């Protein structure tokens, strides 16, 4: 429980305040959430406008609070399609000061247009699985089912 008690302490003190997806070419926010999708043990749902599939790049912005210090806060994200892994991403934030609020921005580039999946094939069939870690320590795993509308 030693590492498990610490993971629980971090999770209990951790909150996603807000998150945005922004078209990096226009600067326009496409999608905004205020729900804490770090919360495990529930299948979250998100509806995103299907025009996100035509973006060359999307700026992802997350604002999070952490009571607990983290040495090397990072995310692993798997994109599952009808239960099959299509892409896996790794994002590193690094040191988190205890009881800080933090904005974390990442630019996610689109595959060439010819490789992008159609909205009608994707919608309802995509799960994003996010593992939140401090270094080696798994703090939380959350799942979000994506609809393209």
């Amino acid at each position: 429980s030693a590492k498990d008690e610490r993971a629980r302490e971090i999770l209990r003190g951790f909150k996603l305040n807000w998150m945005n997806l922004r078209d990096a070419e226009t600067g326009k926010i496409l999608w905004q959430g205020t729900e804490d999708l770090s919360v495990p043990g529930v299948e979250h749902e998100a509806r995103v406008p299907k025009k996100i599939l035509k973006c060359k790049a999307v700026s992802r912005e997350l604002n999070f609070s952490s009571t607990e210090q983290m040495e090397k806060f990072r995310l692993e994200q798997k994109v599952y399609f009808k239960g099959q892994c299509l892409e896996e991403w790794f994002f590193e934030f690094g040191f988190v000061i205890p009881n800080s609020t933090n904005t974390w921005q990442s630019l996610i580039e689109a595959a060439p247009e010819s490789q992008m999946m159609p909205a009608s094939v994707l919608t309802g069939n995509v799960i994003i699985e996010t593992k939140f870690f401090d270094d080696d320590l798994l703090v939380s795993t959350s799942r979000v089912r994506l609809f393209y509308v």
Partner: peptide
């Protein structure tokens, strides 16, 4: 590494 979305 690019996304397919």
């Amino acid at each position: 590494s690019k996304t397919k979305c």
